[PDB]
C-alpha cells in the first residue's frame, strides 16, 4: 500500500478509532478505508479535523511530542469573553501543569459553515460566543482548561486545522483522501 492520508470531520460523541468499543460510536461506520489510524487523536466530545494515515513513520512525525504544530480551533463558550480575558489567552495563563505558550484568540461570528451538534447545545439566561483559538501545544484538554481558567467555559470544541491540513469543504461526518 502507498501512503494514504485521510481527512475526516469527526462528529460529536464518536471515538477517534476503528477498534470496536462496546457502548461507543467509532469510525468504521463513517470510513471504509482500511489500515488507517489517527495521527493525533481528537477527544470523543470534540468535533472536527481528524487526520488518519496507514504510515507509522508519518504518524510518528506528525505526533512527535514537543513539535509545536499549529492547531486552529473554533470554540463555543458560555458568556462573552472580555478584552482582558482574550489578552490573557493570547499571552499565557498558568494551568495546573504549568504556563501556556502564547496563542491566538479572537472573538468571531458563528461561521455559516458551522453545523449544529447532534444533539443540540442544551439557555435564555446565558449568552454564548464563538472564539477562534490557535495553539502550538497539545496538553490534555488544553483549550477547555484555558477558557475555563479565564471564566468562559467551553460548550463546543471544533478542530479546524492541524499543521498542513484543514476542514475546508468537509462536511460533518465526511472524509476525503488527500494522498
> How is 127-172 classified by DSSP, letter by letter?
-EEEEEEEES---TTHHHHHHHHTT--EEEEEEEEETTEE-TT--T
Q: What superfamily in CATH does domain 64-168 come from? A: Alpha-L RNA-binding motif (3.30.70.1560)
User: Quick one: fold of 1-63+169-178?
Assistant: Alpha-Beta Plaits (3.30.70)
Q: Please check whether residue 134 is in contact with residue 143, taking contact to mean a CB–CB distance below 8 angstroms.
A: no
CA distance 134 to 160: 10
Element (H, E) at 51: strand 47-53
For residue 21 the three cell numbers come to 468499543
Domain with CATH 3.30.70.580 in the chain: 1-63+169-178
> DSSP secondary-structure letter at 28?
G
**Expt. technique:** X-ray
CATH 3.30.70.1560 in the chain: give the residue spans. 64-168
CA atoms of 176 and 170, how far apart (whole Å): 8
* Cα end-to-end distance, the chain, whole Å: 12
Of 53, 62, 73, nearest to 177 (Cα)? 53
Q: Name 78's bridge partners.
A: 128
Name the CA radius of gyration of the chain, rounded: 17
CB 6 within 8 A of CB 33: yes
Q: Which SS3 state, helix, strand or coil, does residue 38 take?
A: strand
Place of cell 442544551: 122
Nearest-CA neighbor of 105 among 140, 139, 129, 138? 129
- Residue 27 in grid coordinates: 469510525
Question: Does the annotation count 20 as an active-site position?
Answer: no
Catalytic residue among 13, 20, 43, 168: 43
Amino acid at each position: 500500500q502507498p501512503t494514504r492520508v485521510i481527512l475526516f470531520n469527526k462528529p460529536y460523541d464518536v471515538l477517534p478509532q476503528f477498534t470496536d468499543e462496546a457502548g461507543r460510536k467509532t469510525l468504521k461506520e463513517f470510513i471504509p478505508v482500511q489500515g488507517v489510524y489517527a495521527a493525533g487523536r481528537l477527544d470523543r466530545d470534540s468535533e472536527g479535523l481528524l487526520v488518519l494515515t496507514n504510515n507509522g513513520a508519518l504518524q510518528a512525525r506528525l505526533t512527535q511530542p514537543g513539535k509545536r504544530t499549529g492547531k486552529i480551533y473554533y470554540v463555543q463558550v458560555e458568556g462573552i469573553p472580555t478584552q482582558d480575558a482574550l489578552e490573557a489567552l493570547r499571552n499565557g495563563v498558568t494551568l495546573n501543569d504549568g504556563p501556556t505558550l502564547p496563542a491566538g484568540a479572537e472573538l468571531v461570528d458563528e461561521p455559516a459553515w458551522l453545523w449544529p451538534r447532534n444533539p443540540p447545545i442544551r439557555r435564555k439566561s446565558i449568552p454564548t460566543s464563538w472564539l477562534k483559538i490557535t495553539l502550538y501545544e497539545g496538553r490534555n484538554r488544553q483549550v477547555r482548561r484555558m477558557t475555563a481558567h479565564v471564566g468562559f467555559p467551553t460548550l463546543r470544541l471544533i478542530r479546524y486545522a492541524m499543521g498542513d491540513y484543514s476542514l475546508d469543504n468537509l462536511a460533518n461526518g465526511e472524509w476525503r483522501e488527500v494522498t
